[PDB]
Amino acid sequence: LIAFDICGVQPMNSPTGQVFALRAVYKKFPALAASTQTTVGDIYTHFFQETGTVYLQASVQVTIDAGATDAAKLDAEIKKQMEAGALVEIAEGMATSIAELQEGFNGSTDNPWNEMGFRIDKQVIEAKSRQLKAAYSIELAQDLRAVHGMDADAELSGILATEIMLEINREVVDWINYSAQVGKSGMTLTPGSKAGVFDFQDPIDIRGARWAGESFKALLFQIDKEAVEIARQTGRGEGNFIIASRNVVNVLASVDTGISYAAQGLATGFSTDTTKSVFAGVLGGKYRVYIDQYAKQDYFTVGYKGPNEMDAGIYYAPYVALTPLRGSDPKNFQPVMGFKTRYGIGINPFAILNSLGKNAYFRRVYVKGI
Amino acid sequence: LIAFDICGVQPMNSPTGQVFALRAVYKKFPALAASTQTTVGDIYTHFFQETGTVYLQASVQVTIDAGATDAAKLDAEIKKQMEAGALVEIAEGMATSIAELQEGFNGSTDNPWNEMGFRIDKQVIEAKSRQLKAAYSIELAQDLRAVHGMDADAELSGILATEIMLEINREVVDWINYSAQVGKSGMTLTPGSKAGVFDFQDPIDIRGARWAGESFKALLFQIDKEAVEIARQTGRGEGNFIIASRNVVNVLASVDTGISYAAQGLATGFSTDTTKSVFAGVLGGKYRVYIDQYAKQDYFTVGYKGPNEMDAGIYYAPYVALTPLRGSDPKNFQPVMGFKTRYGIGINPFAILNSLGKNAYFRRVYVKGI
Amino acid sequence: KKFPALAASTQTTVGDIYTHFFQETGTVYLQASVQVTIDAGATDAAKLDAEIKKQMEAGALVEIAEGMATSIAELQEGFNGSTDNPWNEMGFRIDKQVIEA
């Protein structure tokens, strides 16, 4: 039990109630043109008639066809010079490099200090409750005691307590899958991809892989791609843990030999304790990985978690847990037991209106084809 | 954290300020023809109607069909002799052999007491300063202490120190990737490719590699090609390290075991320490590799670093570091923390503006297809 | 402080404050006590004034002037509470004079 290994806890000693989080704050190149005599290392921006522009670095001090007054002719000369390696391209890189040039030369004593670009802020949380009832009967309880000498209600209580703990852990996962951003999107797309869904039977998603062996590894590859996007947006780091369906976990477990575990002492001893509430292990040796036992379809979500409870992107503050209830239902006089909790949750706002599909600490991907 | 692993330092005792760098200095084989009997070990030139010319070494003293007055027939006889192993084709392996022959043969002591390929020189290093301001609210600090017993400002300081360290090493990398020459060019560019970019989905770049598995290895190969170009131009040997985006590093990490840590300690201990500040590992057992945590888009750079600080290709000479700031601003009476540094940087001359796209110690390539 | 104008057809809502400049005797700031539509056919300022006045007579609309400007200022400032840099001074200068005996 306990899903909080992957969220800030920041337990409250009162409801209502608050948590803290490490929220981050958040080029006029010469055009390449006919007759331009390039200079090695310099970058020119060329507009092709098709597909916009490119940024080209001269490796060769070459004049680009002075008679090419026809953009089409110029485009052809450029393509040839590019094929020849005379002109080469790193688009976003070059934009950065010229900015560095400009800023370096434009430096001035002034007062050019920069801020420690983190809002570092707080949110208010109500210790929202959850609860369950035993909904059991005397014929059962009477017989459990009469037949096995069983403590009857005590077991029903143990089941019920387990169930509420599992249900809250499920809720933690549901919130992650609520607030997580759509993965396999934007920066994490393969140009020929299906936008947000990983299909193990699809040559693009599996990157041409053969059999299950490589298709399974290809999923792990997409997972690393997602982990990076988390790092990029959060400014905190690569996703550190994964929540995924039984199908996905079993798939991932088939690779890297010793990443996910069965808690194999279990099978060895003939089901000594199934502990179906725990982390499988560490995926790739890098991601703490847990099974979403209630996965609705089939999926995985990659998330980040630092040692600092303010560095989770999601929080759970267990003010109250397992408070028992006792009574009966006069409609049939059947006995009543139950358990309630109070905790309060929240996320890094990044602006639950601002939570849905917006939380930079998590990327959610739909899985098909297993 | 520091990125000194790949820089010369020669720390300053005064600003402006200077460091030293190892500024570098900066054949008609007789034609094979119809009726000619070859001499074993000798080499002849032959231009085939298709393919063109190669140098052919005789293993057999064979007359090449005196009746082959038809170039097509002559090519055919030669082809047969090649199949026979009588004539074996090589291009530069032979061009050098003839140059060596000629140099030996017409050699004379003369007076070639030429200089080593060096000049050695020095640059003036301005201890450019950088300042980071915590810019935090007192209310936050009060609540962190009041709510969780947190040290607040002390912790904000830890963030601050970390951020300035990150900014400094980030800057070092930005200059590397400004002075680096664009790779996947010249000697390292296949004529049919994309000039400056390695696309993992492109059969030319991936050398026909099957799926992501082999495509990933194909990049590793391109890295060796870039490493060699560095050796060719610098004369100090091949690239020794890699600076690369999180996508590239994760890709490289998928092969050959020792490429990177998995940050397994983090996951193993339940989110203890992400340690995202040090070299990932060694690519192929050859290139010391580290993540550019601020990569703008996706790219990698291969670079050389000698044990002699003067052989780094880039210099960082810390003068002042992590000097703390304490103060406040009465207009809102907010407390102030911050840090100053002074260091100064430089690049092997290769003759800001004087380093852009010129530095042979590094080769930068844009990445697509991950 | 830029109260919404009261106008024909407007359904005023209780507690909300509207501004209305009458053809005669300047303006008022009216707080709805009753949710009500101000004669949608009153496109004639003369009619609109008559309707607003009628609603005022009805007790539907009640005026206070600076008292409401103060409340809306609080509304706005409260919602916009932040650090500009804003600290306010103790509202005193405290000074001295030289006097001969």
mmCIF file with all atom_site columns, N, CA, C and O in Angstrom, chain B residues 329 331-334, chain C residues 83-87:
data_model
loop_
_atom_site.group_PDB
_atom_site.id
_atom_site.type_symbol
_atom_site.label_atom_id
_atom_site.label_alt_id
_atom_site.label_comp_id
_atom_site.label_asym_id
_atom_site.label_entity_id
_atom_site.label_seq_id
_atom_site.pdbx_PDB_ins_code
_atom_site.Cartn_x
_atom_site.Cartn_y
_atom_site.Cartn_z
_atom_site.occupancy
_atom_site.B_iso_or_equiv
_atom_site.pdbx_formal_charge
_atom_site.auth_seq_id
_atom_site.auth_comp_id
_atom_site.auth_asym_id
_atom_site.auth_atom_id
_atom_site.pdbx_PDB_model_num
ATOM 1  N N  . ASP B 1 329 ? 15.357 45.048 -0.338 1.00 0.00 ? 329 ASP B N  1
ATOM 2  C CA . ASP B 1 329 ? 14.814 46.213 -1.044 1.00 0.00 ? 329 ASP B CA 1
ATOM 3  C C  . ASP B 1 329 ? 13.613 46.798 -0.290 1.00 0.00 ? 329 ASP B C  1
ATOM 4  O O  . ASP B 1 329 ? 12.509 46.250 -0.408 1.00 0.00 ? 329 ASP B O  1
ATOM 5  N N  . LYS B 1 331 ? 11.503 49.053 -0.678 1.00 0.00 ? 331 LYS B N  1
ATOM 6  C CA . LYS B 1 331 ? 10.251 49.426 -1.314 1.00 0.00 ? 331 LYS B CA 1
ATOM 7  C C  . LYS B 1 331 ? 9.152  48.378 -1.052 1.00 0.00 ? 331 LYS B C  1
ATOM 8  O O  . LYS B 1 331 ? 7.950  48.689 -1.109 1.00 0.00 ? 331 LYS B O  1
ATOM 9  N N  . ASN B 1 332 ? 9.556  47.116 -0.830 1.00 0.00 ? 332 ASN B N  1
ATOM 10 C CA . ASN B 1 332 ? 8.619  46.067 -0.526 1.00 0.00 ? 332 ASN B CA 1
ATOM 11 C C  . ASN B 1 332 ? 9.242  45.253 0.562  1.00 0.00 ? 332 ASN B C  1
ATOM 12 O O  . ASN B 1 332 ? 8.712  44.238 1.010  1.00 0.00 ? 332 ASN B O  1
ATOM 13 N N  . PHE B 1 333 ? 10.400 45.727 0.960  1.00 0.00 ? 333 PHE B N  1
ATOM 14 C CA . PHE B 1 333 ? 11.219 45.200 2.023  1.00 0.00 ? 333 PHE B CA 1
ATOM 15 C C  . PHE B 1 333 ? 11.424 43.714 1.841  1.00 0.00 ? 333 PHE B C  1
ATOM 16 O O  . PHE B 1 333 ? 11.357 42.933 2.788  1.00 0.00 ? 333 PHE B O  1
ATOM 17 N N  . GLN B 1 334 ? 11.675 43.302 0.620  1.00 0.00 ? 334 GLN B N  1
ATOM 18 C CA . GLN B 1 334 ? 11.883 41.887 0.428  1.00 0.00 ? 334 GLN B CA 1
ATOM 19 C C  . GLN B 1 334 ? 13.347 41.596 0.662  1.00 0.00 ? 334 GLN B C  1
ATOM 20 O O  . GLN B 1 334 ? 14.189 42.460 0.393  1.00 0.00 ? 334 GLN B O  1
ATOM 21 N N  . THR C 2 83  ? 2.593  42.393 -4.795 1.00 0.00 ? 83  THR C N  1
ATOM 22 C CA . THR C 2 83  ? 3.745  43.300 -4.520 1.00 0.00 ? 83  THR C CA 1
ATOM 23 C C  . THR C 2 83  ? 4.119  44.032 -5.819 1.00 0.00 ? 83  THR C C  1
ATOM 24 O O  . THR C 2 83  ? 4.239  43.349 -6.858 1.00 0.00 ? 83  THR C O  1
ATOM 25 N N  . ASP C 2 84  ? 4.200  45.362 -5.781 1.00 0.00 ? 84  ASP C N  1
ATOM 26 C CA . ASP C 2 84  ? 4.504  46.152 -7.004 1.00 0.00 ? 84  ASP C CA 1
ATOM 27 C C  . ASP C 2 84  ? 6.009  46.452 -7.040 1.00 0.00 ? 84  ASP C C  1
ATOM 28 O O  . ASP C 2 84  ? 6.743  45.673 -7.676 1.00 0.00 ? 84  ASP C O  1
ATOM 29 N N  . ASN C 2 85  ? 6.441  47.543 -6.397 1.00 0.00 ? 85  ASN C N  1
ATOM 30 C CA . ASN C 2 85  ? 6.748  47.570 -4.940 1.00 0.00 ? 85  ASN C CA 1
ATOM 31 C C  . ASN C 2 85  ? 5.734  48.495 -4.264 1.00 0.00 ? 85  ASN C C  1
ATOM 32 O O  . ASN C 2 85  ? 5.723  49.696 -4.606 1.00 0.00 ? 85  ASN C O  1
ATOM 33 N N  . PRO C 2 86  ? 4.880  48.015 -3.330 1.00 0.00 ? 86  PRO C N  1
ATOM 34 C CA . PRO C 2 86  ? 3.798  48.812 -2.782 1.00 0.00 ? 86  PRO C CA 1
ATOM 35 C C  . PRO C 2 86  ? 3.809  49.303 -1.354 1.00 0.00 ? 86  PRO C C  1
ATOM 36 O O  . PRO C 2 86  ? 2.723  49.596 -0.853 1.00 0.00 ? 86  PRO C O  1
ATOM 37 N N  . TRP C 2 87  ? 4.878  49.242 -0.584 1.00 0.00 ? 87  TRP C N  1
ATOM 38 C CA . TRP C 2 87  ? 4.546  49.475 0.813  1.00 0.00 ? 87  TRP C CA 1
ATOM 39 C C  . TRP C 2 87  ? 4.096  50.877 1.035  1.00 0.00 ? 87  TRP C C  1
ATOM 40 O O  . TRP C 2 87  ? 4.599  51.797 0.386  1.00 0.00 ? 87  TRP C O  1
#
